Amino acid sequence: AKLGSVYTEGGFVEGVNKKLSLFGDSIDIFKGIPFAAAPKALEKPERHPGWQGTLKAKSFKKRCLQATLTQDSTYGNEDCLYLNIWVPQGRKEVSHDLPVMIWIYGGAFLMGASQGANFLSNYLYDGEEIATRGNVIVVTFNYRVGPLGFLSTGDSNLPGNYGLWDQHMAIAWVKRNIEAFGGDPDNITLFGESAGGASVSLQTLSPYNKGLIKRAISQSGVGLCPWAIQQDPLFWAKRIAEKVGCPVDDTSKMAGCLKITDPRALTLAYKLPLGSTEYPKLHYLSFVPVIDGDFIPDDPVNLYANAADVDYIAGTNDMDGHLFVGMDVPAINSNKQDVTEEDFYKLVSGLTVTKGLRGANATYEVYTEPWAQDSSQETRKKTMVDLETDILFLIPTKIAVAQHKSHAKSANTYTYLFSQPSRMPIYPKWMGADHADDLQYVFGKPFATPLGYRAQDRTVSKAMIAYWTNFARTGDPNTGHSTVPANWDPYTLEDDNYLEINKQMDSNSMKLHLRTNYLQFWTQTYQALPTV
Ligand SMILES: C[C@@H](CCC(=O)NCCS(=O)(=O)O)[C@H]1CC[C@H]2[C@H]3C(C[C@H](O)[C@]12C)[C@@]1(C)CC[C@H](O)C[C@@H]1C[C@H]3O
Ligand SMILES: C[C@@H](CCC(=O)NCCS(=O)(=O)O)[C@H]1CC[C@H]2[C@H]3C(C[C@H](O)[C@]12C)[C@@]1(C)CC[C@H](O)C[C@@H]1C[C@H]3O
Ligand SMILES: *[C@@H]1O[C@H](CO)[C@@H](O)[C@H](O)[C@H]1NC(C)=O
DSSP: OOOEEESSOOOEEEEEEEESSSSSSSSEEEEEEEEOOOOOOOOOOOEOOOOSSSEBBBOOOOOOBBOSSSOOBOOOOOOOOEEEEEEOOOOOOOOSSSEEEOOOOTTTTTOOOOOOSSSSTOOOOSSSSSHHHHHEEEEEOOOOOOOHHHHOOSSTTTTOOHHHHHHHHHHHHHHHSSSSTTTEEEEEEEETTHHHHHHHHHHHHHHHGTTSEEEEESOOOTTTTTGGSSSHHHHHHHHHHHHOOOOSOOOHHHHHHTTTTTHHHHTTOOOOOOOOOOOOOOGGGOOOOOOSSSSSSHHHHHHGGGGGGGGEEEEEEETTTTTHHHHHHTTOSSOOOOOHHHHHHHHHHHHGGGGHHHHHHHHHHOOOOOOGGGGGGGHHHHHHHOOOOOOOIIHHHHHHHHHHHHSSSSSEEEEEOOOOOOOOOOOOOOOOOOTTTTTHHTTTTHHHHHHTTOHHHHHHHHHHHHHHHHHHHOOOTTTSSSSOOEEEEEEEEOOOEEEEESSSSTTEEEEEOSHHHHHHHIIIIISOOOOO
């Protein structure tokens, strides 16, 4: 089957077709379809005007303007609002009424390309593997990151959340123009890790995506995360301003100015440290979503009515915050150096700032219940990893799923926990599933690039890819185009049952009550403490 030229709302598009099997199994590949007209700096997206005759969709366009390794904004260009579609094809004839799985990349909201990092055409987010096995259409798309993506003054002079709008624009395009590619319009599945996970959440919660999303999958990130919303945006708008020589004495004046400023300078004005800083790095992420009067109307925790009829899944990697706490504290040297009570306290202090010393010493105690002297440092270093994992991903997620469940009209909820430890020979032996370790497995990387992967890896990859895809089709992580090695039971507030995910996927896999106690300390105790 060869879809050849497809008829979008903008005109005919034409992409390759790749020979897979001999019994006619193929894969139509479309790279670079524009979903929106090149955006006006610090302005909402506008539909694409359309083209002349036929668009040669054969290559990944350029990512949105972003900083390289903060030394130069040497990446991407203001023009980047495109999407890449993967349609698996059948010998007898072209695919029809298939499920659709859109993917939202993540990079602290300040980084990212729809193609995903690569090495000699080995694109981290190549939706071929996931599409083939699943027999589902993979859609990856670009969106504005960095200041240009979410710069805000707090009020109508420059609301922010442009990046999200872009995301919403893609979805809207995939809703309208997917049937022509053979997809099922009324079966759109949003899925993404980190900022993407937070984005997945935000999109479902946003009243703008009313009837566009059918399924949703957040991973290592949810809207309720601390890093997922900017509480004081105007504090940072003023900063960029002073750097780009704009008037900081009035929002209207600022805005008018910023929109006129050279995007490269607007981008390179902000630089995340990544070095000895007084405060834990969470405090430096500045440009991320915010609450506005329309997209994200209220606090995400209050918007969950909207995702009521949106099947949902959310999970976390057991040691998700390891990455981060690494830079915050060089714990990882489970060799020479050793962390102390003071080093742990300081950490807790910096991570509790909102509630002050009251919340600080309280939290310290609750995380210091168990013990292990300097001789048994391992428990300490692990605890820090646990501290970060809790506030950064676990707890927010835990309240997200729980929250969804309570509000679900008719929508299955599920939660997981990627336990498959990292290969990273650098980290201490006690290392579990770090942040982003889930990615490769979800993308069939173990099958696309076998050498450098072993059975287990192909097993986890196959499992996850088995689940996501079944989910995308029916909503049940067990039902669809593939068989599941272990049954994924729908989440219940009572049991707080989660599917642990790793090599051994049998029956004991679905566990219950993952740190319900800390869910309690944060949701009930620490929360009651006064804001300082
Ligand atoms: C061919 C390898 C590259 C390193 C090389 O072989 N050097 C060894 C001898 S020497 O050093 O050259 O002296 C391969 C084997 C497995 C590979 C990796 C890899 C980059 C690359 O192709 C690697 C690391 C990557 C993370 C690259 C990004 C990608 O999207 C994921 C991918 C996973 C995996 O396939
Ligand atoms: C990470 C937890 C604690 C906050 C965190 O430690 N922030 C660290 C930065 S700081 O140094 O304190 O500033 C989070 C995770 C998800 C959170 C909760 C939460 C309080 C809180 O921030 C929690 C429990 C709250 C009921 C707080 C009020 C809010 O509008 C609803 C919200 C639900 C959810 O976000
Ligand atoms: C501060 O933390 C210590 C433990 O490090 C605790 O004993 C104390 O009660 C806490 N509060 C104050 C005000 O010191």
